[PDB]
Design a protein around this ligand. Structure first.
Ligand code: 10Q
Length: 390
């Protein structure tokens, strides 16, 4: 561990997202910010809202600069509108630098802020191509790298607890680490394996094979990346393209057939509970995603356990039972490797070398019989054909 100042600087959980503390303005205004590798804007609440107990007050910052331009950001689950500007920004438990970055001051929103999440803004870590209004609005990390000597790379260790965390607990627990500008060896075990970043917009990758307990899903690999596959700290579930989801669920049901679960469970709608300590992890299969390697015709695989894809939730009666929701769901916008994948691994976003690294996380949840894994290499042909083209 060479970055002790940044280790354990995250808080939160997959259901509400993971956040890091940041400061904006002069004097510094502290805010908690959602870490999102699935978007590219730095936006913070800048007006009163029922679910916020603090927000960015531009009139109190001597270094605030108005860009005199609005920004509207509508998405599937919600939306927000803001006013663009720039200000000095820092990350207390991060690199010891202060940079002038773009900030979308959120003045109106719908279904964005969450009651009890404890975060007041979002940090989009993806590329400029997907920044709103357009790619001319420089993303925070781009500014950080351009204005300082911080290496163009960051790594994330998202730590799921393995059990439900109440309001007080989630506030006092360490949710993981975001190492800005480097890789901390204390956050993973084994080796790091890299997959190429296919294109720099979202953090796009290419999946070349999928197994459920060693059994090949056997679909045309293009299906696995239709219409794209991305790594997103801002998505709770492992989301799969409709046809892949259908085949995967069928296989997971078959592997766990000694126990029957209601359709609502598989739809991610209702929870399933077991007497305290008796969750039958062993009847559920491990899932392996093979990713294109850096060497020609070479791939590697990352394997997760049900301890990753069964999300712990508190029982409706807050009993002593151990309950979960199935965290794999369908998508009409490609594969999304969300917290379900990320909680099992230390993930290195090596922007400098256009690649993403994976290693078994020192904080992944497992049992005495199985562990998450990152293994390689495997001989794989025509992997370029697995990538989708409109
Ligand atoms: C998938 N995904 C995502 N990666 N990021 C967004 C948000 C995620 C959460 C959220 C809430 C709770 C838990 C978790 C988790 N884990 C995440 C709140 S808002 C932001 N977004 C944008 N997209 C494009 C441009 C700008 C923006 C913004 N802002 C589309 C949203 C989305 O649907």
């Amino acid at each position: 561990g060479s970055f002790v100042e940044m280790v354990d600087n995250l808080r939160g959980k997959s259901g509400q997202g993971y956040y890091v503390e940041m400061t904006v303005g002069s004097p510094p205004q502290t805010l908690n910010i959602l870490v999102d590798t699935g978007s590219s804007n730095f936006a913070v609440g800048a007006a009163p809202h029922p679910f916020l107990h603090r927000y960015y007050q531009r009139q109190l910052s001597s270094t605030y600069r108005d860009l005199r331009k609005g920004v509207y950001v509508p998405y599937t689950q919600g939306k927000w509108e803001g006013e663009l500007g720039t200000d000095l920004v820092s990350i207390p438990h991060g690199p010891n630098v202060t940079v002038r970055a773009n900030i979308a001051a959120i003045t109106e929103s719908d279904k964005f802020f969450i009651n009890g999440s404890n975060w007041e803004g979002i940090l989009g870590l993806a590329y400029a191509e997907i920044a709103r209004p357009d790619d001319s609005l420089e993303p925070f990390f781009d500014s950080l790298v351009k204005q300082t000597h911080v290496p163009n790379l960051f790594s994330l260790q998202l730590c799921g607890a393995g059990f439900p965390l109440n309001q007080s607990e989630v506030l006092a627990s360490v949710g993981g680490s975001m190492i800005i500008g480097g890789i901390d060896h204390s956050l993973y075990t084994g080796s790091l394996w890299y997959t190429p970043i296919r294109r720099e917009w979202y953090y796009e990758v290419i999946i070349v094979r999928v197994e459920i307990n060693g059994q090949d899903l056997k679909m045309d690999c293009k299906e696995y990346n239709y219409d794209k596959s991305i790594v997103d700290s801002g998505t709770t579930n492992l989301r799969l393209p409709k046809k892949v989801f259908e085949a995967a669920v069928k296989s997971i049901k078959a592997a766990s057939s000694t126990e029957k679960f209601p359709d609502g469970f598989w739809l991610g709608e209702q929870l399933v509970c077991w007497q305290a300590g008796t969750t039958p992890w062993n009847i559920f299969p491990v899932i392996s995603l093979y990713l294109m390697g850096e060497v020609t015709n070479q791939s590697f695989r990352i394997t997760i356990l049900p301890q990753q894809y069964l999300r712990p939730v508190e029982d409706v009666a807050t009993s002593q039972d151990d309950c979960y929701k199935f965290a794999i769901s369908q998508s009409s916008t490609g594969t999304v490797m969300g917290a379900v994948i990320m909680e099992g691994f230390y993930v290195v976003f090596d922007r400098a070398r256009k690649r993403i690294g994976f290693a078994v996380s020192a904080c992944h949840v497992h049992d005495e019989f199985r562990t998450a894994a990152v293994e390689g290499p495997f001989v794989t042909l025509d992997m370029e054909d697995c990538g989708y083209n409109i």
